[PDB]
């Protein structure tokens, strides 16, 4: 489907955002590393909120179907 | 469907957080700045996570209607 | 369903970060809480994640189902 086209981003994205959190499990991100890891994380979300919105989307076009 | 409107709250933080977004792409945001980007992701999150419950507990309630 | 074992985490994770999320508007958060919270966001996103997933695979199983 389209959602999954859309997890493939999240999927890449969070191996980046894993990386960064494992320097911040370590005590060792830098201020440009947070703000790359807070880049990262709006981005994501923006995905996500789109396969919501198209998994919420297709939920109420079956629930329109029966 | 309720889960709409918790989507409508989604695509106004995201607005924000677009906007916060191009001030870390420019290399312009400040301290207080990324503390507002953070306690947006987790406002975002809260609502994102009350709408997956429902999402999941539509499909669950339709799975035993079947 | 599985979903659910999932959505219990992302409630506790999420319980943390309405915590920090209070102190961020309290403006007493510290540096090493700022990155707590970027941590916990990271983690609770794989979960919700995970979840998406596994619910956009039943939706695409069912729709196979019909």
Known sequence: SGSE????ELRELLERLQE???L???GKITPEQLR???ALLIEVLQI???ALRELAEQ???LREEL
Chains 1, 2, 3 share one sequence.
């Open 24 to 26: 911040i499990e370590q």
């Open 36 to 38: 790359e890891a807070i």
């Open 5 to 8: 086209e859309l997890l493939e």
């Open 20 to 22: 960064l959190l494992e």
């Open 48 to 50: 996500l909120y789109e």
């Open 59 to 61: 939920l109420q076009r």
